[PDB]
Design a protein around this ligand. Structure first.
Ligand SMILES: Cc1nc2c(N)ncnc2n1CCCl
Ligand SMILES: Cc1nc2c(N)ncnc2n1CCCl
Ligand SMILES: Cc1nc2c(N)ncnc2n1CCCl
Ligand SMILES: Cc1nc2c(N)ncnc2n1CCCl
Lengths: 258, 258, 258, 258
């Protein structure tokens, strides 16, 4: 069974990576960073984000595993001291799948897959877009930007904006506002919105058509934008589970105490 | 097919009720407020709430219809001028189901069914409870109270507390905080929490065991409480749909403009 | 110079109280709980709140001192181990004054002095009041209640409701909302409001005239209420300062780390 | 008495400007856009913002007047139909002063005067700064940015971020957070902070020293930044008042109804 390991790049992560590779060598494991079936991330949730996007074209044949060399992450939920215990079991577990968010941009198409969220800002000018939900004009948003988050991504940027945390077993997506203007003439919903599967949220410009669109940690500028389309992707990320680590326990350890 | 009609009690609602009853008399409809299969509510969402709780023992044999004599409600989504058009079609539509919230209270059991939400406060003293999620201690809440809302109830009390609006096709429940205390020694999650089906949220006392527990508009005091249990109910409320009125359009008309 | 000491009532506070009284006996200090000029509070901010209200008729002749036997409080900012050091200096310091909030209730008058805040709720029914600012109708509030806080009280209940923290050198008062309803027909400002000196905020009923009015920790029901009047009081509480303990440092220790 | 008039540039504003200039010609008024003593703004609060910054070097000799050709603004509080009535009285009123915010940037100094607010973001990377209040380390902020607002500016960007509205008679400044990160290891105060006169709020970098600093509508990038200093300015903007238009009425008309 093929595998590969990505490292944060610091001294602790590179050394932990070489010790796991040496451990897998004692088994029948084959290192292959081209067509792997097991992808291990050593570092933080940001390193795991990079590992996910390096193989988003083969998500159905890959089970991800995360190791946090710093603090407890949501995707990297393995202690460095438990690395050798992980090498044995990984060489012969069950698979756990999380939903993902699809982002489509159209000009005068480009699709992206997000694990945390996808946000839209205005390249310098004021951000004004009309929010269309299933071909129905819902609101004209006026403010800093908007954030569409996955279930597992609600603990990231979505949380800082006031969004709700939702369990990853729910196939849904959540949209939250960034510093919206609300006076007697400009009105937005304010509340976060949770959309189920097969619901399409479209963002359409009003004046400016240049938007700073981000997907997870990748932020790239798009010029002459006609529409930004959001929907829950049909593809899912697969994790390799070896023990019981509930999502609500991960939330407790990351935010309450540990 | 049996039916019944509840009225808000004012002049406009009582007159609209008698005109619909006379219209149903022209068909083969039988008025029966004991074992009805069609329950019509004329007034507001509060009147619809009363109509739901009067027949929560026969939810699987009843399709609800709401008429708003005041402003546009979420459950009463029919104009009074469309009443006669409603009488004809209702006498020979499709059924639409929404999930519900189950509330269990234990002393030293009482179950309730909520359409909007179920909240917990403290009878006078300070409100302190431990929040347990699937037999896991998540947080010790310290503040005014807590609110567990249904999907269709997220537009009510849940919205005023900062909760997210979620589409009723999602079988889930959402918990939100009321004026929580957060300093260097008392810590809550703050964010709203969305729980899927088969997840159990338990509230357990610390000192005071008397709580002011509410279900929709019913508020009753409970003494010597041992545990408050929350989970998505297996029973669903059934609406009779005659036209396309999306939930996100109901949200737009109630909060954006109409 | 006369003095008195109030205790939380537990073992640690009562013992610390008797040791300070014995220390003051070694000086020319006279214990008098009737007409004191120095009032020491041993326990928490709640105990300090009680000590303030026991002598609100002689605020101009009393300098308050707080000792926290538990965690760091905002009004009780002295460690128990620093008690003997406090007894010496207190027997021959400078005075520091904080503004207070005045609350007037009228029926068919009763004035109260608050150190933290004064809140208004509805005795069971829904809470609806019109908010009048300097004889100008500002908004019709619809929700759980309202909270008018002093500058030093903004770190208490006001903080849990989203209010801003303001330095006690600012003679002002801050009003915050409790779970307000905001749809297309009911509209409140939502933002907290900071009022300067000589500004009068009046609350007037709409239907129900019975309100659960609270002042600091005292909560008492009022029937047949005509108006609730708010303004910054002309009286100030006086603290005895012996060292530099800035307000922003007290906020840091209570909420960031310590 | 010298005067000048700035226009939004559209057809309605330019025509209203030429009609007022012709009206002032019938009096002893002298048009001078170099050393004026009366500055009239015709358009919106953005146009008024431009008019303020064009003459921030002569604030003590200038009384500002605003005219809104669109909707009711906070600084432009005169209807276009009341223009001729304004020309007569302005040619022989009382002066009203509002406080301002001072912003100092230091490299390896540049001072700015803000009427609404001054915000700090990170030029691309993550925004991390230490917040120092009167030479005391208060918090290490981690998020999108920070916003320091004037009293009259609290109805603008400060409001969208959750800040409190404060009456302009209070000489103070208010700081609010933008999408802060708060987990078990990163902690900010969250609440808005209101600082009185003579209090200094300093922002110091951690890693990145390039910041996108904005003052009102001007946004300019600063490289190799050592410190960002905030304090209530000693200079005040002067308005020419002809009638009673309370601040709380301006808030009502802009946000509640009009
Ligand atoms: C990169 C990333 N993702 C998440 C996530 N889902 N929850 C919480 N933190 C996350 N991070 C790191 C930001 Cl501190
Ligand atoms: C009784 C009730 N239920 C709801 C609901 N689900 N959404 C919005 N408003 C509701 N109301 C009436 C309160 Cl105004
Ligand atoms: C009674 C009290 N007053 C305050 C205050 N001003 N700030 C913070 N905490 C306070 N407390 C105790 C509540 Cl934990
Ligand atoms: C430029 C500007 N200043 C303000 C202000 N102080 N309050 C409200 N709106 C303002 N605007 C225009 C933004 Cl819509």
């Amino acid at each position: 069974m093929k595998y590969m390991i990505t490292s944060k790049g610091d001294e602790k992560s590179d050394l932990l990576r070489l010790n796991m590779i040496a451990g897998f060598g004692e088994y029948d494991m084959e290192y292959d960073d081209v067509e792997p079936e097991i992808v291990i991330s050593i570092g933080g949730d940001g390193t795991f984000l990079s590992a996910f996007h390096q193989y988003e074209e083969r998500l159905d044949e890959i089970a991800f595993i995360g190791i946090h060399t710093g603090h407890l992450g949501f995707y990297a939920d393995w202690r460095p001291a438990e690395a050798d215990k992980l090498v044995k079991l990984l060489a012969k577990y069950q698979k756990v799948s999380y939903p993902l968010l699809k982002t489509t941009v159209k000009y005068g198409e480009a699709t992206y897959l997000a694990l945390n969220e996808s946000t839209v800002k205005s390249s310098g000018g004021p951000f004004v877009v009309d929010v269309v939900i299933n071909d129905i004009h819902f609101e004209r948003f006026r403010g800093d930007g908007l954030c569409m988050s996955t279930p597992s991504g609600t603990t990231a940027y979505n949380k800082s904006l006031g969004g709700a945390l939702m369990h990853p077993s729910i196939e849904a997506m959540q949209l939250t506002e960034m510093a919206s203007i609300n006076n007697r003439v400009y009105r937005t919903i304010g509340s976060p919105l949770v959309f189920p599967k097969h619901h399409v949220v479209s963002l359409q410009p009003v004046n400016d058509k240049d938007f700073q669109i981000s997907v997870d940690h990748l932020s790239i500028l798009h010029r002459d934008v006609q529409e930004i389309r959001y929907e829950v992707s049909a593809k899912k990320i697969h994790f390799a589970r070896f023990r019981s680590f509930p999502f609500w326990r991960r939330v407790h350890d990351s935010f309450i105490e540990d």
